[PDB]
Design a protein around this ligand. Structure first.
Ligand code: HEM
Length: 154
C-alpha cells in the first residue's frame, strides 16, 4: 500500500498533538490495551503483576515504556513509508525475544485509534482516522513481512 501526502498530513497533524503529552498518551494506550485484551499483559513479565487500572496508572515503569513505544512509532510515522531501517530492529526483537503475534499489533492499533478519537475529536474526524488506520495497516503489513523473513510470521 501507499499513502498519499494528504493522508500523511492527516496522520502527522494529529501526531503533533499527541507529542504535546507523550507520557499521558502512552499511559492511556497501554491501559486501554490491557483492559480490553488482558491476554496481552501476559507478554510483559515486567507488568504482569499489575492487577487494576489504579495500579497501571501509578506505575512509573509502565509510563516510561509507553514513552519508548510512542517515540519509536512516532519515528516510523515521520518517515512517511520509508521506514525499512527503523522496522528491522523492532521486528527482530518482537518476533524473536518478545514473540508478539501480529494479532496483538492489531490490538494496540485499535487502542491507539480509540485514544486519539477520545482526546482529539477535532483533529480526528473520519478522514483523519481512515488515514491513521492506513498508516498502521502499512506498519503491520511491513512488520508481518519481516516476521516471515526472520522465521516467525505469526
Ligand atoms: C506500535 C507497536 C509497538 C511498538 C512501536 C513497540 C516498540 C517497542 C520498543 C521500542 C521496545 C524496546 C526495545 C525492543 O525490545 O525492541 C519494546 C519492547 C517490548 N515490547 Fe513492544 N512495541 C509495540 C507493540 C508491542 C505489543 C502489542 C506487545 C505485547 C502485547 C509488545 C511487547 C513488548 C515487550 C514484552 C517488550 C519488552 C518489555 C521489557 O521487558 O522491557 N510490544 N516495544
Amino acid at each position: 500500500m501507499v499513502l498519499s501526502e494528504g493522508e500523511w498530513q492527516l496522520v502527522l497533524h494529529v501526531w503533533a498533538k499527541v507529542e504535546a503529552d507523550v507520557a499521558g498518551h502512552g499511559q492511556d494506550i497501554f491501559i486501554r490495551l490491557f483492559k480490553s485484551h488482558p491476554e496481552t499483559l501476559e507478554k510483559f513479565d515486567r507488568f504482569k503483576h499489575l492487577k487494576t487500572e489504579a495500579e497501571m496508572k501509578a506505575s512509573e515503569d509502565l509510563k516510561k515504556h509507553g514513552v519508548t513505544v510512542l517515540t519509536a512509532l512516532g519515528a516510523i510515522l515521520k518517515k512517511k513509508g520509508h521506514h525499512e531501517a527503523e522496522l528491522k530492529p523492532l521486528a527482530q526483537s518482537h518476533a524473536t525475544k518478545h514473540k508478539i503475534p501480529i494479532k496483538y499489533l492489531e490490538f494496540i492499533s485499535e487502542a491507539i485509534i480509540h485514544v486519539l478519537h477520545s482526546r482529539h475529536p477535532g483533529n480526528f474526524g473520519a478522514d483523519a482516522q481512515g488515514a491513521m488506520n492506513k498508516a498502521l495497516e502499512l506498519f503491520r503489513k511491513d512488520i508481518a513481512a519481516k516476521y516471515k523473513e526472520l522465521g516467525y510470521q505469526g
